[PDB]
Amino acid sequence: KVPHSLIYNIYPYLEEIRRRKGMMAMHPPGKDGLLMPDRVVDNRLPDHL
Amino acid sequence: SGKLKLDSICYLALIKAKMSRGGYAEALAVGREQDADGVPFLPHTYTHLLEAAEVADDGEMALELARRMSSEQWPVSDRGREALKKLSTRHHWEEVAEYK
């Protein structure tokens, strides 16, 4: 681990607590099967554009 | 122009402004500016560019426009239907290409 994830209270350090899982497995699938979350347009594009 | 990523409606207001002064030859250059910027063509842009090919008699310009509506499967407006029938009467280009 990184040492600052062991003594400091910042919330993305909570991602250091859990084990490594695949980003296609945590995010919901698409029409074809497992899909990366940054390959769909509405996830990578902000809402004001 | 250079800073904002303009859409088809912002290009449509420039098309309607050119056609108000009799700039039907210049209104086709606005449509050529739209595909150069990567902005796709909407059915309200087709019905105003086909009207600009009536006064300018640019039958070769409407050859690529009518082939682009069949490739993109847009619904043709009633103002765009009469513009295709007038140019197919003058140039006879739809009868020799088998495209209706």
Partner: protein
Amino acid sequence: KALSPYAQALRHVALRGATAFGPGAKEMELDMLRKGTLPADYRPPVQGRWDDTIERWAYAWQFPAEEEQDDITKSVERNASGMQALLEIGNKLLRSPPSPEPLSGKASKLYPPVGRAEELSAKYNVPMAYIDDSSEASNASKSLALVMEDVGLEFTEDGLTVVISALSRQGYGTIGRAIFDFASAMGLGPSAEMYRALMKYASRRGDVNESMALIEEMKGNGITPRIGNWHELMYTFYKAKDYPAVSQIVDNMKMYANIEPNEVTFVLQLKALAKDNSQLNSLPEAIQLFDQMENVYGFIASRPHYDAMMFHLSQSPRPEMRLRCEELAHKMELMGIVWNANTYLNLIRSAQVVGDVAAVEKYLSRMREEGIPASIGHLTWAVQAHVQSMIRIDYDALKEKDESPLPTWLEHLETCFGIYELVVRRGWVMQLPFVNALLRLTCQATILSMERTPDEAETIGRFEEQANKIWNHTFDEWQLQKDVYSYECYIALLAHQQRIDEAEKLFQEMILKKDLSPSRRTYHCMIFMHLSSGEEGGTARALRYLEAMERAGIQVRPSLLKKIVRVNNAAGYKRDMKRRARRIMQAREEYLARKEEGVSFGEGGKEGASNQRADVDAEGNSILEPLAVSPTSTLAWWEKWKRETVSKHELFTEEGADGTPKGETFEEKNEALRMMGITSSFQTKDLVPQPDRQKLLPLIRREEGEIAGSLWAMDGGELSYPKDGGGPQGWGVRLWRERQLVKREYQKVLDGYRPVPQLSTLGNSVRTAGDQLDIERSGAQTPGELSDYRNFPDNRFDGGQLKPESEAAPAVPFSAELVWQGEANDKLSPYKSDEEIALENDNTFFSSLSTRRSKFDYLEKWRDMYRHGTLEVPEGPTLNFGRTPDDHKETMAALVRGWYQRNRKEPASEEELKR
């Protein structure tokens, strides 16, 4: 040193003279042993065979093993005719499958003959393809075994995995699947390695769903997947840029599949952790995984383990990780694993992230010393090393020395453009990361020029024009397509210029049209651009970019959150200026209205002060009035300047270009002071006292206290001075401690950390009177100028006055015209090959080798050129240094003949041709 091996050989013979081409040291020992004149401390070379065995043992401890793999799939796929025969056989099997039939199998022209079966196959354990019953399937099996034996295979369960792998690595998914199903239908069972060779297609393509469908298919047919299937699934998730899924597959393979990991498992896991951005702890996880593989599992690390570890260690610019990478490379070269292009590429990657160009040039010289050719990626990361060296210039130290960093920027630009002229001269195919590195270099030069020298607009314009030339013309010159990094550098450039609409336009053109997934850095750029801009709703769009980072799997680091808070607190000033400009414009409009309507003319008459006088109250009694102050005072002039000068609304008509009130620059400040009738003593920023440049004064203020005391004194009581009683609070101890701090500063002066101070009046008045006379007749400010006045008596004027610096020219020796002195100041010789330098220097037979080039090849050629005797070398070292304090004189006296003949023999040839 960055010397070429040609220049290294020339310097070698310059240092050793004529004995470098004679006998060796051990040949001199053999002659001393044979003649009998050998001292006792010398080791006598008494036996040749046993000394040969000793040296072979000592060199066998460093001898590298052979890691080359004669893979059958690569031998098949390089064979074009066998690949075409397999392709047409697979097309015949795919378009029309054969008939598993009895007699009259010759009914078709698809499967011609080449020159009871099921119950025969069921009894004697013979597969169906190995039995010929004169069928179409038997003819197809004979054609397939005829083709597969031409490429070296055997047509078995082990042979068909090779052809399915060789087809699947070249596309051809349905053809390999048709061959797989034809083999599985003809008795040769669907082994797990055939499923692995099927999954190689989706692994190379990167399709996760096809690989998982093949996993579920081999599970449905009753085949438990071995470690090769999970390895190809890990490579499928690695090729699809899903890096923690590899670690999840390894964890579930250890837990549920009960499969102990091989070394290829550790290689794929380190390759996935080298690009993993899911969590923050990828590098300590990789360190602990390498330690667990070496110590606990007992595996010995090979070249792929070292490469996957050094590629991950080269990404962090921490010095401990760079030290780990260097010690890993040293353990690699110590364990009998020689360095290759990937090892030098990892070393250049580790040296470029800290901005160390000297280590990159030493690695580029060591790579051409061993004969390893430098590819385009080495020069790409050398350009990125120049980028990171431009980043990490100590600009505050140059601000103390009043030095502009502009010639260093011009040198860093012209070196990399010389590299770009080098890569087009060798005929290399132009790669996308090289042009991206040049674009990054120019955009970073523009950003650093806007940050450090904001008033030099012409340099910013030149850097912007070069960046637009690279962005607009260079990509389509080599027919290259722009990628995430190419848009990332240009978006960072446009975001630093506060051109928000063009940056957002290119952002949505990258996302929508070209369908590119933006990186984390170009998301940080769009966050910090809207944060730094003080317009309304900037953080409302920065949180939209944060949401787009969150819901697309982009990593949100805690350093990003701390920088968001810091940048928002810093851009609060810009937000407050853009909010105050609105009230300024409102007050301007109201002033222009009320000075036209005429309410101020009615309000100027003090009718209330005329009716109710200053000495008469509301009832009529006499009240006390304060006496008038002197008009020669400062406060009377300040209220006269408040009343008589122009209004606050008449200073500026329009506001600033970007939302802010005018007056931030010095031209608007000086114009506003001219409108208020005040001529500024400080016109520009070089006439600013700048109290951050002080070094001795804050050191005095920190420990003891304020040395001035009466700097801030209102009425004579806010002064900080020692007491008059004495003791520890008196003047003596305070002056003693201030003298001790000045002694620490003077000791810093004596050791070269601080510049030498100028001559003070207190220092001059205590000096020797002759030195005072020399100072007052020379006008020297520093004692270095006095040392130049004494040690150069021919420099001064006739009245003893000192001449300036530009009127002195020292003698430059000819020994700076040597080849190793020319390569030290070229700044392109590490980026040049051996052939380019050998073409540039002499272009003769003397440097011609006839392809491996090294220093010892030149020495071996010049040895037989000396003994023939076509090469003449003078006896003795012509390059002398290190022995006597006067050594440059003796090496100048040894090269006068050679340099004079070098400069005089070509005009002798010019005058001998009878011009």
